[PDB]
Ligand binder design. Structure first.
Ligand SMILES: *[C@@H]1O[C@H](CO)[C@@H](O)[C@H](O)[C@H]1NC(C)=O
Ligand SMILES: *[C@@H]1O[C@H](CO)[C@@H](O)[C@H](O)[C@H]1NC(C)=O
Lengths: 49, 49, 47
């Protein structure tokens, strides 16, 4: 249930919250909001056991 | 440590603390009673024997 | 938010001189603000 932002274009500022669930472009190719090669979701969950 | 006296300084409503020419506080505005107390250092001087 | 009200004659709306803006309302929001827009009032016509 606990997720972190693995990927973002720039570092955040102090006391700023980012909740935008938009795709990140990790490569030269645009991703157009759809996952695929070199296009990953920014939010990943922790494996707490 | 100082003497608290009545003041004739027209503080603005937002303003609380005070200061002087050399950025040394000359007065304080008390929260409990909204009055301005001028702060003056206690009497002192040099002793020559 | 800082504000000031200054009566002006029939001249350039932004006048000369100094009118310092008193700290009016310091809102504890903590949100991201990058764009803004002004709100106007309109009266219904009834015609
Ligand atoms: C207590 O402090 C408030 C301001 O923080 C003031 O408005 C109020 O009059 C005070 N009450 C008494 C009983 O002094
Ligand atoms: C506020 O949002 C814009 C776009 O929605 C973003 O680019 C900007 O970095 C945000 N502000 C902060 C301080 O992160």
């Amino acid at each position: 249930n606990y997720l972190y932002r693995l990927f973002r274009k720039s570092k955040l500022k102090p006391f700023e919250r980012d909740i935008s669930t938009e795709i990140y472009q990790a490569g030269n190719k645009p991703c157009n909001g759809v996952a695929g090669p070199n296009c990953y979701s920014p939010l990943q969950s922790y494996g707490f056991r | 440590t100082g003497v608290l006296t009545e003041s004739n300084k027209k503080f603005l409503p937002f303003q609380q603390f005070g200061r002087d020419i050399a950025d040394t506080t000359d007065a304080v505005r008390d929260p409990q009673t909204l009055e301005i107390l001028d702060i003056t250092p206690c009497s002192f001087g040099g002793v020559s024997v | 938010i800082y504000s000031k009200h200054t009566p002006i004659n029939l001249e350039r709306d932004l006048p000369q001189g100094f009118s310092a803006l008193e700290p009016l309302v310091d809102l504890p929001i903590g949100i991201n603000i990058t764009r803004f827009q002004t709100l106007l009032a309109l009266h219904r016509s009834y015609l």
